[PDB]
């Protein structure tokens, strides 16, 4: 029986403990001997599976912490908001957002950080942001910033009522395991409640709010003359002047003749020629159809009546020949392992930004984002960088289910048990091809870099020599040209110009053309296959193995996070799970970093421009990426070298701000290296003189001074290492676009 | 079912597996020269050589830095010969020092079975590389890799 | 003694399992009872079913055996676990309860191998045993 | 005068100055007048002159770039530009030095004096930040009475 | 034939024309839309060989109906294929295993 | 037979073939008993 | 082999022997010690290097102490 059940008042509402460090662990309940106590309490605040032996205990914890990060998100919007509604631009470019640079950040005039704040437009000067926080505001039809104040109220009371239910469902009503553990309940109202009615109540916010003053304001209507939202919903005459179907109501969607709904539920396809944005009258019509697919979806499973699946039958019924027991225990494994599903959860969560970060950019979903150059590489980067953590953090709790909630007893000859028995084979076969895939992928550049040294230019991989030509890719863009009308009869333009098609222009400026595809671009492919691959080798081996393997049959006593097993055995540095996240996380940065240089090259050469009156687009490198990005001296010279000076000449100006961070970035990331290339020995010993110079003068501190542990030694170097590389490139990429753009 | 352990020794560090030990598998192994039954050491040797002297010419002479010239195919085999030495050269060595002179009754995996073995392999190599080049030179159909259809 | 007709674990089979090396050098086995049938882990990777008498395993490596043992002596309760080393020539010895009882343990019989009559401190430096054949000790 | 120019009468400096002042204007002509954004740049065009003219009546000497040099030698005509606030810093670091020093004592005589480091008795810490104002004489009162300085045989060292 | 060590395997090639026409009898479903002609997805798959090999040394080029028929029909094809190999291994007249 | 001729008579045995006979050599006799 | 040598520190605790994931320490009498007992090591040649016996020392300077030397195969925990 699918039923709530919560303990009264669990834990006492008080600060008795909030003056005890340390009092959710046994072993730091004690107290700070040495200063390695104080790392350990943030290593291990949010380790609940470390604190108690109670699944329920752990429960309410997570869903406590969720309500608190909720309560974050909600403020965190809500400055955004109230940034926009008081520090910002924003009437300025709705009546002109070709011309004004967006900005919603001032910078105090102190220390001459006021130059900061640059002539961004419209009577205006900030600080340029490049989140695309006015597009979603002119996409949702807001059109002042009382309205904007309203949503940063909202989101304050948003932010309180998530805070007080955090603490209320931790120390008032906290739910039961029993209450938890429905995870076909839970589905069903995730599926159907929270993702159907989201985007059935922001479709009916589209056709009635969005899609209206985005017409009028494409008709070139004064924000100020458009009418308001409750006019437009309660005068249906009004309304069905821009949209003459409303006149016919209701009825034709109760009796199906939903044809009558075409006006404003349509499947046109491609970008608004105004705006440069999809058609908010697809996205009505998508997020409709989105809602009943979800809401269909979310009455799969078994509750309370009979009627529904049952995921334990489903798994433990699909198992074949090569598996097997097959999906056997899984069921048990999610509903026992926050761990587990955190993985899974984090695994899709980084893919979908990743996918999210490439349709964005090339569907342009917003009125006036595409043409905002800053806006779209800021996004596109920003969300594969959030993929890439998460994918690493799938992995790391991956191999933390493996070495904590992992037991053979229950797992005997099912998938897992597989897996790990033949692990080597998976393993060895994977080094395989990231070797063939490193060769064939960057000894291809080196053979071009030599051979244009050596003036046998005709010998390299190009275009105007040796062909590598991606047909698959370019058939399949041929498909997606061609699609409108043949294999997506209704839809009158391809889902993206990107495929293929006509230029779609905005403001004299590029929004979406062509991406042509060479063999720079088959280059470039391939060395994504093999970063992405080497990444999974790197993950996966230590996944695999995290329990035992030939070198330490007994590694899950070791623990998921140790040193090392000593310098015995050859040498057992880096030998856990949470050493092959450290590894794997510098293998990420490495993937995403030539992902999004990819990109930035890419688009800055053969997408991005300004079209002159011959309908002729200059580019704002201009085709440097055919010929250039074939050798490392091209990316080296041609992107590097040539689009840093953006960033190296920022002093004096607005972008002044990207410079230093640009410098302070290098700084960081050089400083992890002290960090990365050493051990804690030295240190230790360095120490110990400092505290011989202290003690000499009669005081020490009662914590022993101790060097970082190992594990905190290589996190520290790893952190340093991803914040001054990702700076880098965030001050470059900034600087850059902001400048051509 | 269809994977278990290997020889019925669970404990080997292995697994019979469709891929390793199927009937077509087994076959095709057993009737390789590396492990048909009946060839000598230098027969084997002969046959591998043979088929790898053979597709030695075609990347040479396809892609080599002397390609777009009238003498690609000579180019091509004299490279082709040179690297048949140089592995020729590492078969020796490598025989001279994994093997001792203990006699096994040439068993490929003793002395003289390895000497036959690779006098067989670069015989047979360089037969084969030469079979290519003859083919080649004669054969407009393999100098256009069928473009003369075209 | 090894009794080599022990029936075995009944695994399913991996890739983690002894290679050339054991049939070439050496090859570690390890026999305890069970009182039922249950599941433990290989130390190899993969679970396992002991039997319900005496088991046999063979592995690579006395860390493998010994990892093992420590499993059936902490997570179960089997402690008459016996570690032996196997030789291509059939030279079967035995290793662990090398005097029938474990090491965490005195007995009498045992004699001190690599005991030391001072502490640490008291070590030589090498340049008063360089050129010598004395030892740090 | 020691090597360089007076800034107050250079022409490098002048130009400096004159080139601020252009770029502020440039970026002032494009805004209306009495606008937040015109109001800023004036101030900005203020605090710039300002600064010049207060750079030059200081004294500061000036080189060939037009950017003022400072004389950290000893020279007392240039005590400003490194002594004097060098002097306030280290005032300010005894202080600082002298107030931890006693709180690490004062922490280490309790009955926890880890709990004490990590949760800090702040009326007794306060008591030490108000004594610092005197730590030069305080910390020499203590090294002569013997208190600072540990003696060699008392103070843990590793073997040689 | 043995699929493993000593694990037997039928491999009937009725199975195989079992599953090619339960794709190829839907594929015979007519569409008006270019990709098509007018024909389905099989009988367009059988013109397009026919009217390549006609020029046969020439491929047909990108953009050919051929390539997205030649993908789609196969892709179907396997996907019974695989169906129909395990509904006859172990759905069938001799399996073991409560599938 | 000019010193003209000497780089083309040299480079490809000191860089081709001296290594090549020094590497066979040395792994027979690092690898040796 | 790993050079494994213990000293007259030793106070018999046992957790020498009982951290060393092969068997190589052993517990045999003494009477330096209230325990009565004092660690060898007559199996060094399985030792492996791991300085487990190491951590696993409740004296100022360890009781135990491994020099690694020449590795052979079971030192470098080859299972192969
Ligand atoms: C420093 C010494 C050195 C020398 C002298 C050469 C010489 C040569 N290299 Mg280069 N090469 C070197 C180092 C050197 N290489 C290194 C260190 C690398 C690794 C990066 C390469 C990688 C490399 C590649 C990838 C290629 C070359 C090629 C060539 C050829 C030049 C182009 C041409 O038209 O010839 C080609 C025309 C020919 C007719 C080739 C005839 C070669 C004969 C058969 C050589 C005789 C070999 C000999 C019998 C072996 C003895 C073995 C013994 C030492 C154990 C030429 C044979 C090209 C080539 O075609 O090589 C085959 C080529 O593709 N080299
Ligand atoms: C959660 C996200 C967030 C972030 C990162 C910021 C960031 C900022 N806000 Mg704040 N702000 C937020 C939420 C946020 N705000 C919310 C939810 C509200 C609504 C109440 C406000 C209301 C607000 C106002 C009214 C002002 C700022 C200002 C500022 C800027 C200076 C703040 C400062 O120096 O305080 C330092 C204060 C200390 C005590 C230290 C800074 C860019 C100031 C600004 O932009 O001035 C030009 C400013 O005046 N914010
Ligand atoms: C949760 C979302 C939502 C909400 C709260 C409303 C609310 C309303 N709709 Mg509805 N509407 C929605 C989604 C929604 N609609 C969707 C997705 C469609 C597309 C099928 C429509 C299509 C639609 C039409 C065609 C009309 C309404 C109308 C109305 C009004 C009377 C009922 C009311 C304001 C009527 C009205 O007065 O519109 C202004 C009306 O004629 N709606
Ligand atoms: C849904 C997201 C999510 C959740 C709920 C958790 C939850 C958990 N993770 Mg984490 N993890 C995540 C994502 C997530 N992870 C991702 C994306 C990664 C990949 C990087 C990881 C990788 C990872 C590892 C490798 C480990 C964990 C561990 C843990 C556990 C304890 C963490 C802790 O105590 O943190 C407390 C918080 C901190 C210590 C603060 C860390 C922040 C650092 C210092 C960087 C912050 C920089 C910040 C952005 C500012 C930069 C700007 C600069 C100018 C200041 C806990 C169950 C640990 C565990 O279970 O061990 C047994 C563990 O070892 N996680
Ligand atoms: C690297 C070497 C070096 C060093 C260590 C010093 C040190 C000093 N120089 Mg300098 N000086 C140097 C090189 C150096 N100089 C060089 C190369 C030049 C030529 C370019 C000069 C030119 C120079 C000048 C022109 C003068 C100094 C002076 C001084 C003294 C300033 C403080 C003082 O008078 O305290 C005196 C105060 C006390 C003893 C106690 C004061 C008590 C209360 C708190 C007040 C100081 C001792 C000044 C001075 O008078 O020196 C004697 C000074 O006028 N120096
Ligand atoms: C705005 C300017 C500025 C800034 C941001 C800093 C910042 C810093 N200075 Mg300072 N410094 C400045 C100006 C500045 N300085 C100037 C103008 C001078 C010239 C007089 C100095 C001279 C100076 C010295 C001599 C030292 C520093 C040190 C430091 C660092 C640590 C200070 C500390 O821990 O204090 C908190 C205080 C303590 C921990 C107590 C002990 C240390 C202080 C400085 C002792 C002061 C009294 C003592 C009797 C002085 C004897 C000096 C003699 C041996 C030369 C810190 C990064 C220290 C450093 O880098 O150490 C590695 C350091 O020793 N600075
Ligand atoms: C693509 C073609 C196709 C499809 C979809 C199915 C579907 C089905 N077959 Mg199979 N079958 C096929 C071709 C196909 N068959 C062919 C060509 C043959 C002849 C060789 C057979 C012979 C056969 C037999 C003898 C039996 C089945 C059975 C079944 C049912 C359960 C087992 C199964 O395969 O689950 C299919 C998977 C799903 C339904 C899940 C959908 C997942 C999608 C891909 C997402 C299921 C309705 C068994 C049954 O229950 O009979 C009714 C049964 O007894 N089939
Ligand atoms: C610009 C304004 C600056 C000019 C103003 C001049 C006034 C400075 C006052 C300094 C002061 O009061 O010191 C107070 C300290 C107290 O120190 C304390 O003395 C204590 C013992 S007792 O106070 O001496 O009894 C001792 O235990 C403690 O550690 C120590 O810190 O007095 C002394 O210890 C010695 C004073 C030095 C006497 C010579 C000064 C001549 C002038
Ligand atoms: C997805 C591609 C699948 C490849 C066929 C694989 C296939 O579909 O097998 C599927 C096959 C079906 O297994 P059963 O029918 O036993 O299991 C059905 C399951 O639903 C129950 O667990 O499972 C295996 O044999 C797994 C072997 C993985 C094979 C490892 C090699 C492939 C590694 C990945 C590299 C792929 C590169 C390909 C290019
Ligand atoms: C695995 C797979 C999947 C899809 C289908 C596909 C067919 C591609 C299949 C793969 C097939 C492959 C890899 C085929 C490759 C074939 C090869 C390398 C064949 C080689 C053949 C070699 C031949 C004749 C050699 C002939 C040599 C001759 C006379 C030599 C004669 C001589 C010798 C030996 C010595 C003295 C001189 C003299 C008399 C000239
Ligand atoms: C430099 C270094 C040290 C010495 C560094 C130490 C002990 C760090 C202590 C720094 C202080 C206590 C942090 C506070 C001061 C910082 C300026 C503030 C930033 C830190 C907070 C945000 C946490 C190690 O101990 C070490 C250990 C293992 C591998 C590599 C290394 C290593 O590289
Ligand atoms: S641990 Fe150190 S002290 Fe305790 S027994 Fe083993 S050796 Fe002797």
């Known amino acids: 029986k699918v039923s709530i059940t919560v303990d009264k008042d669990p834990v006492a509402t008080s600060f008795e403990k909030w003056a005890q460090p340390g009092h959710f662990s046994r072993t730091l309940a004690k107290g700070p001997k040495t200063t390695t106590w104080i790392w350990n309490l943030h290593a291990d605040a949010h380790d609940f599976d470390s604190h108690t032996s109670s699944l329920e205990d752990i429960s309410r914890k997570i869903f406590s912490a969720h309500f608190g990060q909720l309560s974050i998100i909600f403020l965190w919007l809500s400055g955004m908001y109230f940034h926009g509604a008081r520090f910002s631009n924003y009437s300025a470019w709705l009546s002109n957002p070709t011309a004004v640079k967006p900005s919603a950040q001032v910078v105090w005039p102190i220390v001459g950080q006021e130059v900061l704040n640059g002539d961004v437009g419209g009577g205006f000067q900030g600080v340029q942001i490049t989140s695309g926080f006015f597009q979603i505001w002119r996409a949702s039809g807001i059109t002042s910033e009382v309205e904007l104040y309203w949503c940063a109220l909202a989101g304050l009371l948003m932010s309180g009522l998530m805070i007080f239910a955090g603490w209320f469902h931790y120390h008032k009503a906290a739910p039961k395991l029993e209450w938890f553990q429905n995870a076909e309940s839970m589905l069903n109202h995730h599926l159907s409640g929270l993702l159907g009615l989201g985007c059935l109540s922001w479709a009916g916010h589209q056709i009635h709010v969005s899609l209206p003053i985005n017409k009028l304001l494409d008709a070139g209507v004064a924000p100020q003359e458009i009418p308001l939202p409750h006019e437009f919903l309660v005068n249906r005459d009004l309304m069905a002047q821009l949209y003459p179907s409303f006149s016919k109501g209701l009825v034709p969607f109760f009796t199906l003749n939903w044809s009558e709904y075409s006006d404003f539920l349509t499947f046109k396809g491609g970008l608004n020629p105004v705006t440069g944005g999809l058609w908010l009258s697809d996205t009505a019509h998508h997020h409709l159809a989105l809602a009943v697919l979800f809401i269909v979806a979310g009455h799969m499973y078994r509750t309370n009546w009979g009627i529904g699946h049952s995921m334990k039958e489903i798994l433990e019924a699909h198992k074949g020949p090569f598996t097997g027991e097959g999906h056997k225990g899984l069921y048990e494994v999610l509903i026992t392992s926050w761990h587990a599903q955190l993985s899974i959860n984090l695994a899709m969560l980084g893919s979908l930004s990743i996918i999210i970060a490439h349709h964005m950019y090339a569907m342009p979903p917003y009125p006036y984002i595409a043409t905002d150059y800053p806006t779209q590489l800021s996004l596109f980067t920003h969300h594969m960088w959030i993929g890439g953590f998460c994918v690493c953090g799938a992995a790391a709790h991956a191999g933390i289910f493996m070495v904590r909630d992992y037991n053979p007893a229950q797992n005997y000859n099912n998938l897992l048990d597989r897996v790990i028995r033949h692990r080597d084979a998976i393993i060895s076969h994977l080094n395989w091809i990231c070797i063939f895939l490193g060769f064939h992928s960057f000894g291809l550049y080196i053979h071009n870099d030599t051979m244009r040294a050596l003036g046998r230019t005709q010998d390299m991989f190009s275009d105007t020599a040796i062909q590598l030509k991606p047909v698959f890719a370019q058939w399949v863009q041929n498909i997606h040209t061609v699609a409108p009308g043949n294999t997506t009869p209704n839809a009158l333009a391809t889902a993206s110009y990107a495929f293929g098609g006509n230029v779609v222009s905005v403001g004299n400026k590029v929004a979406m053309m062509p991406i042509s595809l060479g063999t720079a671009d088959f280059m470039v492919h391939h060395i994504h296959a093999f970063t992405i691959h080497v990444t999974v080798l790197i993950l996966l081996k230590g996944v695999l193995f995290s329990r035992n393997s030939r070198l330490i049959p007994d590694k899950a006593n070791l623990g998921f996070r140790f040193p090392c097993d000593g310098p015995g055995r050859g040498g057992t540095c880096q030998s856990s799970a949470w050493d092959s996240v450290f590894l794997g996380l510098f293998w990420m940065y490495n993937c995403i970093s030539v992902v999004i240089f990819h990109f930035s090259w890419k688009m800055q050469s053969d997408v991005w421009g300004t079209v002159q009156a011959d309908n002729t687009v200059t580019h704002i490198t201009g085709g440097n990426f055919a010929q250039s990005a074939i050798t490392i001296n091209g990316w080296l010279r041609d992107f590097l070298w040539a689009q840093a000076s953006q960033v190296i000449q920022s002093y004096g100006s607005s972008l002044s701000a990207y410079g230093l961070i640009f410098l302070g970035a290098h700084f960081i990331w050089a400083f992890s290296l002290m960090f990365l290339f050493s051990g804690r020995g030295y240190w230790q010993e360095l120490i110990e003189s400092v505290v011989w110079a202290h003690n000499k003068l009669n005081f020490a501190p009662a914590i022993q001074p101790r060097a970082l542990s190992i594990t905190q030694g290589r996190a520290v170097g790893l952190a340093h290492y991803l914040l001054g590389g990702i700076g880098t490139t965030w001050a470059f990429f900034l600087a850059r676009i902001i400048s051509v753009g | 079912q269809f994977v278990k352990p290997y020889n019925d020794d669970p404990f080997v560090g292995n697994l019979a597996t469709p891929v390793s030990t199927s009937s077509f598998t087994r076959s095709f192994l057993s009737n390789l020269p590396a492990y048909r039954s009946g060839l000598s050491p230098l027969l084997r040797g002969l046959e591998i050589g043979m088929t790898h002297g053979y597709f030695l010419v075609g990347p040479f002479y396809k892609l080599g830095p002397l390609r777009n010239s009238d003498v690609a195919l000579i180019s091509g085999l004299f490279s082709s010969i040179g690297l048949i030495i140089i592995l020729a050269a590492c078969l020796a060595i490598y025989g001279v020092v994994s093997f001792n002179e203990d006699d096994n009754t040439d068993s490929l995996q003793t002395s003289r079975g390895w000497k036959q073995f690779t006098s067989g392999w670069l015989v047979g190599s360089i037969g084969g590389a030469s079979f290519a080049y003859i083919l080649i030179s004669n054969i407009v159909f393999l100098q256009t890799s069928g473009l003369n259809l075209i | 003694t090894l009794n080599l007709q022990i029936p075995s674990p009944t695994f399913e089979g991996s890739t983690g399992g002894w290679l050339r090396a054991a049939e070439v050098e050496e090859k570690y086995a390890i026999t305890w009872t069970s009182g039922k049938e249950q599941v433990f882990e290989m130390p190899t990777g993969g679970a396992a079913i002991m039997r319900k008498g005496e088991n046999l395993l063979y592995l690579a490596r006395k860390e493998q055996c010994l990892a093992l043992g420590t499993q059936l002596k902490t997570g179960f309760k089997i402690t008459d676990y016996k570690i032996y080393r196997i030789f291509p020539s059939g030279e079967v010895q035995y290793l662990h309860p090398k005097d029938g009882v474990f090491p965490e343990k005195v007995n009498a019989g045992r004699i001190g191998v690599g005991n030391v009559s001072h502490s640490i401190g008291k070590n030589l430096n090498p340049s008063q045993i360089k050129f010598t054949n004395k030892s740090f000790n | 005068v020691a090597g360089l120019t007076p800034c107050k009468d250079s022409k490098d400096f002048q130009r400096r100055l004159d080139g601020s002042v252009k770029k502020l204007k440039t970026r002032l002509a494009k805004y209306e007048k009495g606008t937040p954004p015109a109001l800023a740049l004036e101030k900005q065009i203020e605090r710039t002159q300002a600064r010049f003219e207060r750079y030059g009546k200081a004294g500061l000497l000036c080189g060939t770039d037009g950017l003022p040099h400072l004389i950290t030698d000893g020279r007392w005509s240039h005590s400003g530009e490194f002594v004097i606030p060098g002097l306030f810093f280290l005032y300010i670091a005894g202080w600082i030095g002298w107030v931890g020093r006693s709180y690490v004592l004062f922490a280490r005589e309790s009955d926890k004096p880890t709990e004490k480091e990590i949760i800090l008795d702040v009326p007794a810490a306060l008591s030490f930040v108000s004594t610092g104002f005197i730590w030069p004489v305080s910390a020499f009162k203590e090294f002569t009475s013997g208190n600072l300085i540990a003696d060699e045989s008392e103070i843990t060292v590793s073997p040689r | 034939f043995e699929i493993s060590d000593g694990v037997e395997f039928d491999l009937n090639p009725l199975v195989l024309a079992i599953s090619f026409l339960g794709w190829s009898l839907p594929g015979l479903l007519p569409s008006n839309i270019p990709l098509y002609g007018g024909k389905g997805l099989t009988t367009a798959l059988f013109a397009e060989i026919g009217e390549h090999l006609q020029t046969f040394p020439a491929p047909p080029p990108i953009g050919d109906p051929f390539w997205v028929i030649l993908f789609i029909w196969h892709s179907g094809l396997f996907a019974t294929m695989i169906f129909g190999t395990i509904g006859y291994n172990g759905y069938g007249p001799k399996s073991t295993t409560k599938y | ?33 | 082999s790993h050079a494994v040598k213990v000293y007259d520190t030793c106070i018999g605790c046992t957790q020498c022997v009982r951290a060393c994931p092969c068997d190589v320490l052993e517990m045999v009498s003494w009477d330096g010690c209230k325990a009565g007992q004092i660690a060898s090591a007559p199996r060094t040649e399985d030792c492996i290097g791991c300085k487990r016996c190491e951590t696993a020392c409740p004296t100022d300077f360890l009781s135990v102490r491994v020099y690694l030397g020449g590795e052979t195969t079971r030192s470098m925990g080859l299972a192969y």
């Open chain 6, 1 to 33: 037979m000019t010193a003209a001729y000497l780089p083309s008579i040299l480079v490809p045995l000191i860089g081709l073939i001296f290594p090549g006979f020094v590497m066979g050599f040395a792994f027979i006799y690092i690898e040796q008993e």
